[PDB]
Amino acid sequence: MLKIIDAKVIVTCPGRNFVTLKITTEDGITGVGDATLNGRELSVVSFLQDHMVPSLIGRDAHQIEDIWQFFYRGSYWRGGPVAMTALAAVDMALWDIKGKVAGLPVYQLLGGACRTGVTVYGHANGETIEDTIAEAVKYKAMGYKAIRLQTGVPGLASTYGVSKDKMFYEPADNDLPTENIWSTAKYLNSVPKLFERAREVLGWDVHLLHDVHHRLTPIEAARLGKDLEPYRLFWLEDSVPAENQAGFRLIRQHTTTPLAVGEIFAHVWDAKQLIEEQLIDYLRATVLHAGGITNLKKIAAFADLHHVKTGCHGATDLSPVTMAAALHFDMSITNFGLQEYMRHTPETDAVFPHAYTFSDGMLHPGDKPGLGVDIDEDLAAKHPYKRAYLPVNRLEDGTMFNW
Amino acid sequence: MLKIIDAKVIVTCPGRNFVTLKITTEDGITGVGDATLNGRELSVVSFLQDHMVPSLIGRDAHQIEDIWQFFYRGSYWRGGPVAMTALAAVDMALWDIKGKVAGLPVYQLLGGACRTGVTVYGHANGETIEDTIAEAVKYKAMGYKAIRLQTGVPGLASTYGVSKDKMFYEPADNDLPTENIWSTAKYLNSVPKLFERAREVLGWDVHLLHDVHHRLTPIEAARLGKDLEPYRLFWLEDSVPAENQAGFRLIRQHTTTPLAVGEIFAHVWDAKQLIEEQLIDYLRATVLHAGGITNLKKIAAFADLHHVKTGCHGATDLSPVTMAAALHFDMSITNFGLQEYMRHTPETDAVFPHAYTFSDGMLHPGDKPGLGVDIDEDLAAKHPYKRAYLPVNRLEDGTMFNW
Amino acid sequence: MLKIIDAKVIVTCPGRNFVTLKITTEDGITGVGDATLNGRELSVVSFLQDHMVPSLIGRDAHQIEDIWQFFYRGSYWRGGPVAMTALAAVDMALWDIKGKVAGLPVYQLLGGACRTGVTVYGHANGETIEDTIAEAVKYKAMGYKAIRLQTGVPGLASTYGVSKDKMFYEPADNDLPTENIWSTAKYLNSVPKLFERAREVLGWDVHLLHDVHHRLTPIEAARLGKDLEPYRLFWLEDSVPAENQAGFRLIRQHTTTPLAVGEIFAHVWDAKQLIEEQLIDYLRATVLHAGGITNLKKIAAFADLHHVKTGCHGATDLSPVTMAAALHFDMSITNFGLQEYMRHTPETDAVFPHAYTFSDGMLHPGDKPGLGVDIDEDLAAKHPYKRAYLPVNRLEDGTMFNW
Amino acid sequence: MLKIIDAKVIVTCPGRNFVTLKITTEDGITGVGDATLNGRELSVVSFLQDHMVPSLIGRDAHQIEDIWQFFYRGSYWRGGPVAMTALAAVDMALWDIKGKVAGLPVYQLLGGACRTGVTVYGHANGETIEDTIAEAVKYKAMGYKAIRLQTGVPGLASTYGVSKDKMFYEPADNDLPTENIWSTAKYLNSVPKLFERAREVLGWDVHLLHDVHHRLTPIEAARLGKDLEPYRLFWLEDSVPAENQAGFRLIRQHTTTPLAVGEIFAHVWDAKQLIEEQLIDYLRATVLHAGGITNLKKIAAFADLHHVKTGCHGATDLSPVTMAAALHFDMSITNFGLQEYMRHTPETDAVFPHAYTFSDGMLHPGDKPGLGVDIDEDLAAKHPYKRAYLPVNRLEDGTMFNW
Ligand SMILES: O=C(O)[C@@H](O)[C@@H](O)[C@H](O)[C@H](O)CO
Ligand SMILES: O=C(O)[C@@H](O)[C@@H](O)[C@H](O)[C@H](O)CO
Ligand SMILES: [Cl-]
Ligand SMILES: [Cl-]
Ligand SMILES: [Cl-]
Ligand SMILES: [Cl-]
Ligand SMILES: [Mg+2]
Ligand SMILES: [Mg+2]
Numbered sequence A, B, C, D: 001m002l003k004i005i006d007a008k009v010i011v012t013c014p015g016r017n018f019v020t021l022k023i024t025t026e027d028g029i030t031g032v033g034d035a036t037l038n039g040r041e042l043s044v045v046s047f048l049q050d051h052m053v054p055s056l057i058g059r060d061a062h063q064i065e066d067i068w069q070f071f072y073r074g075s076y077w078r079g080g081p082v083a084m085t086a087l088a089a090v091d092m093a094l095w096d097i098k099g100k101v102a103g104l105p106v107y108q109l110l111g112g113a114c115r116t117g118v119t120v121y122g123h124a125n126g127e128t129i130e131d132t133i134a135e136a137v138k139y140k141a142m143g144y145k146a147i148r149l150q151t152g153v154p155g156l157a158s159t160y161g162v163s164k165d166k167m168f169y170e171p172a173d174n175d176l177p178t179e180n181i182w183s184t185a186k187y188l189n190s191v192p193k194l195f196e197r198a199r200e201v202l203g204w205d206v207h208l209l210h211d212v213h214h215r216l217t218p219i220e221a222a223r224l225g226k227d228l229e230p231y232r233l234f235w236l237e238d239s240v241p242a243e244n245q246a247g248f249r250l251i252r253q254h255t256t257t258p259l260a261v262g263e264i265f266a267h268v269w270d271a272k273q274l275i276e277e278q279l280i281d282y283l284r285a286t287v288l289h290a291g292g293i294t295n296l297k298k299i300a301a302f303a304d305l306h307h308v309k310t311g312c313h314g315a316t317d318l319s320p321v322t323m324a325a326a327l328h329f330d331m332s333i334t335n336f337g338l339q340e341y342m343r344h345t346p347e348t349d350a351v352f353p354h355a356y357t358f359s360d361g362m363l364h365p366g367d368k369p370g371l372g373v374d375i376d377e378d379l380a381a382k383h384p385y386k387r388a389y390l391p392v393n394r395l396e397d398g399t400m401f402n403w
């Protein structure tokens, strides 16, 4: 019986915004969870502290599932990114506690080690094809086994994933949304050239990825998928907005390029049709935005029935706390595919001291009891919240579109 | 060009919590929109004032659809109760402003009057059948053409819809969520007697409704539906949790009792399969919780291709701002089914003076420019926020369940 | 790192045959897992000691999921009752060891407590209706919340569930399989009277079950299901052989009597269509015959996406080791339906001392570290293996049929 | 009335393990059946001798079908490789007896001769493409009309089907499973080159096969299928693990390369969806592992309705007894496709003297009464069981995978 005596939502910006729940049990055992929802951070803060937290006090922290259900069902209005991100943080924290009590790293509870480390991909980008490739060469020298390639679009001032940042990508860069302009035709005409060149310079053993980032229609993705088959990509991610899951039928019907989707998914329902109809090969949903370890685990199992692997989203806006948690999950399942790994700042790392390590293209969560992560509150207090928005995207005619 | 110069979020609790958005244009033309999310109110307040509101400043209030898209797509993490309720408030207020600029009630902009008024249902409930029927008799004498009936379950301390309230039902009643105990079997064995007796006393002209409130499995709903066929109910609402929309296939397959669902839906995607497969007869989604007049209008047109009518939710946690917007939408569509009408408190009515009127079993939005509703800010300020939660539900063995 | 130093298979027959696997770790921490396959026991014994066991030596007992996969995939010939029962024993014993290492009951590792106990059903049976009802009355007085009812068929020497046993049923009763004679028509014409009378005497609060035990065609099950609707059965189990899972479509299409199936299933693939098409309401698959806690947990999460609950089989040929593992799993899931509970003999209980307890219609696994169960090897050795077979069934014309 | 007076399970290892049932009738007529289940041999031994055999004694051997049903249904737990391999051996033996009594080879009972002999394929392999091709040239000179091609994968230490053995392949080569490492990307990049070269050297009249051996996902096989179309393969076998039969839809949708699957199948249910949806062109299931002559015959008939032919598995771990039986089946059906033929050792041939012969690319079962095979018990006793396991396979990251 592990009485919860305190729960606190902490907000800090050591290079970018992060929200963190910290839960303290009667005898001083603590657990932390990530609750960062990029571009909408303080909405999760309230949902937690004004609403969910008062129900945590006095409860038995052992009851992870019951607590999961109490909040998911109890809110009445169900699901959604704000609600499911709040719950992920409770869940992460509860598993962290569980691990400490058991005296085991969290993966030891979830099925134990299924591989020697978690293979990641990094983030090569450049304004030109040459730029991008040079970045990919760098990554390949650094021992990355998988690399994502993004490059500027001829005749467009900007496009997703290209900037001055090289080991990562931080698009929430302004106190109002940065405005972008877009042309599907110009992208579709040019981006295949990138992977053609990538194969010429980099060879065939390295895994290459691409994030389309919500900008195509199904018949368009189908075609990009087709143009990309000669270069044997690891996956083509978020090719089309997926609220209409049937949208992926057209793509699957026309290309064999492997498909990923789901960083934004809040619950299993966002991916069910996609999984059950075998329309994707990788699910990108994370413990952070789809309701924590408890839920992602149920989802991965459903996914394994349909040849679907995990390709968990790994952007900078997932704190080290999420990443510790993602690693314990990644380690413990059979159908793991890949883990995205964007480098945080050295200030972020200082605020969220963690046991996980990177070597030979792989992350490993380490073997500390629980998650193997904590939050330095004093250092945290040194960096207050600063408002920052994700960018937005319009068509050439001004049409409001998808960034 | 109608420049937005200010936009403020107002929180008041004249009998229960309500969140309101009030937008002001350069020329002093104002609009209001409801943003209430029962039991998770402050989270919407944050989502709006900390995140959405700053983007409103300086925009042209005329661009309703662009602003709608800007917010829906620009959030990146899409949909969900929080985001869509916040967007509803914006949408309602822009429509209000549109109305005023045009010197017309909103419904005149959306298609014109399609009926002489909007037929409502009221809520009769009680511990015993005779208590519930006694109440139904009152509502009929009051000229209601439709009545929802809820009654206690023999062998259970409490059930949905049953309490000391007669003209409404207000479960957001405690500083921590009230816990309840549920038995499906006891409920299924008893409720049909409710309606048998209802028909004996009230006869066959009055429409009789029932809200199952999330507590059945499809095969159980099938059976309850069948048991209730003899009494010709207008609808059987929320019989099963709808995240799995294919769930309704089994109900539809076994009973001709007409089906309602959707008060908690945040977007078209929560109902798409239900509508396209003709699994339901009434959609209960509202302008408040499904992204406003803009979104609900698209949804209604889609629903009409498949014999689905509107039966919008209208419990008291929808403020009179919602009700005004709901009544304009209701007036303006071919496929109107019915409108729920729970009496707000006198204090609430005073805080949100409105033009809409109730006569002869029907509401009417009235004919003022805009929505015909405002918030009295001085009066509002006399009624501070008071934290209050919806109740939760567990099975006899203690399993977390749905309320 | 928990090196496996020994792993031995133990065969004993304290009232009936049981096969047990006992794994020993370098530091003297041990675990047990049930490996009993009624009527084909020694085949599992061989599969384990001659083939699987040698691979266990020297492995890290922590790696539960890897060992699970090693054995499932490494056998080459996959699935099947033998292989999956043998793997179940391994899985149970590793979970037992995991529990002990962590100083926690297994259920604490799988999600924590979700209910205050695990509601069971007992078995009332008899030659005549009055004999069966007489027995149901006893079980109700004993505080059972659920009761299975089986009764003799007029015009048939014998039928399933009927015999001189009251608190259990043990058909593995002869050195060569007992032969029986079956008539579908006589059964279908009589059994509904069972439940009519059951309801008259026992009333409508108690859950009433029925195991058809494989003897119908879909169109026949459809009809029996319909005939039994008036009596509101908790479930109708194994109504038809399920190798053809589309068979349930016709039943589901014609009746709202809730359906159970699956005690004999060896893997997820035996139930996948049944679950995904919502053809059933309860899955009867067990940790013993479907590859253990590891597998059953994935299966349960899948079943929960489709309104399917667990109604695990629990006849006496599942040893108390199975029951301990079953109770930890049952305690830990949101979608628990019910647990079958057949009383083991006193001698059996003595051979497998256990922590689980029965009170007020509910079992509880208790709170010892691990599964909370052991085999007493000296006592076990006093009860040699005794060959015993399940009975077989033929039609009136002599056709080999299903028992 | 042919009373069975004795049934004996014989175990021997004349180069590799084989299990054999021998059944003796009252007047001295005997029949033999194969019961070898590679890597799990003694599990079938027990299932037979400890469990099934006692029910054979005293029965009428004429009753092949009733006996088939008695054991398949009678076991209660149904199907699975262990159970279905045991039953195959009973069935083979019973048909062998039947043929002797009738004084005819077994094919004469099953429909008689449908072709002049049974066309086979052999097994070319090599570390390099050159190696493999040279082996295929050899086979083509030896008069083989069909040849399977396997070759080493660049940058992998090992891969399926390559070894020092040339007229066959014996992978169960160790007293614990040999461990292998795997890379899908490296295989997919290189194996098409093999068949390109094969066509250049060998020409277009010879039939060429390839066994993928369980290592791809559907979208991957689809692609390999596509890359292989220019070389017009006879089939691409076991491209993906088939427990999810819907997995083959994606492949069929994208390639016209002919598909085979099923050596591991235990029953019709393992192939039904695959057959009924026309997802494969060849079924590889055998009399050995899918329940003997009786069952495979029913299956072939179902297969003929959907353009599916037999491509029976023929590895060394099917004894001459199985091969005699496979030939009588192959001879007697309209929809025969191909028979795999790996050479046994000369010691195996001595222990299982057989009447079947090989010439001009074809096997023929001969025209002796019954199967035309027996087992030399004295020679058999000269070679005791020796434990040997099939290999296993992990990904580069250590993930437990499919061999
Ligand atoms: O149909 C209804 O009126 C009910 O579902 C509502 O009272 C519901 O319980 C509340 O609006 C939830 O806030
Ligand atoms: O539901 C049940 O309890 C029955 O199906 C079992 O008694 C079954 O007959 C035996 O467990 C088979 O071993
Ligand atoms: Cl939300
Ligand atoms: Cl939301
Ligand atoms: Cl098996
Ligand atoms: Cl088996
Ligand atoms: Mg992305
Ligand atoms: Mg309702």
Ligand SMILES: [Mg+2]
Residues within 6 Å of the ligand: C211, C213, C237, C238, C263
């Ligand atoms: Mg049963």
Ligand SMILES: [Mg+2]
Residues within 6 Å of the ligand: D211, D213, D237, D238, D263
């Ligand atoms: Mg093969």
